[PDB]
Amino acid sequence: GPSQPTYPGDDAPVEDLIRFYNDLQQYLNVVTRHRY
Amino acid sequence: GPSQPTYPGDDAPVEDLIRFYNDLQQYLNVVTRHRY
Ligand SMILES: [Zn+2]
Ligand SMILES: [Zn+2]
């Protein structure tokens, strides 16, 4: 599956936290075998 | 709004990454003024 996303840091702009959130969602969906 | 969640670390168990994901979602919804 996808490799584990890198956390962009506490001080990242909101746009980058949103990007990380989306990548983390995808990662967790694959790890849990639930790609919906 | 809620304070910014603390990242639990790359090596956290999946359950804790899910918990962080949910807390981050709530945080981002409030920051973007879109609590749906
Ligand atoms: Zn892979
Ligand atoms: Zn507050």
UniProtKB/Swiss-Prot annotation, chains A, B:
<dbReference type="GO" id="GO:0007631">
    <property type="term" value="P:feeding behavior"/>
</dbReference>
<protein>
    <recommendedName>
        <fullName>Pancreatic polypeptide</fullName>
    </recommendedName>
</protein>
<keyword id="KW-0165">Cleavage on pair of basic residues</keyword>
<feature type="modified residue" description="Tyrosine amide">
    <location>
        <position position="36"/>
    </location>
</feature>
<dbReference type="InterPro" id="IPR001955">
    <property type="entry name" value="Pancreatic_hormone-like"/>
</dbReference>
<comment type="function">
    <text>Hormone secreted by pancreatic cells that acts as a regulator of pancreatic and gastrointestinal functions.</text>
</comment>
<comment type="similarity">
    <text>Belongs to the NPY family.</text>
</comment>
<dbReference type="GO" id="GO:0007218">
    <property type="term" value="P:neuropeptide signaling pathway"/>
</dbReference>
<dbReference type="GO" id="GO:0031841">
    <property type="term" value="F:neuropeptide Y receptor binding"/>
</dbReference>
<keyword id="KW-0964">Secreted</keyword>
<keyword id="KW-0372">Hormone</keyword>
<dbReference type="GO" id="GO:0005615">
    <property type="term" value="C:extracellular space"/>
</dbReference>
<dbReference type="InterPro" id="IPR020392">
    <property type="entry name" value="Pancreatic_hormone-like_CS"/>
</dbReference>
<dbReference type="Pfam" id="PF00159">
    <property type="entry name" value="Hormone_3"/>
</dbReference>
<dbReference type="GO" id="GO:0005184">
    <property type="term" value="F:neuropeptide hormone activity"/>
</dbReference>
<keyword id="KW-0027">Amidation</keyword>
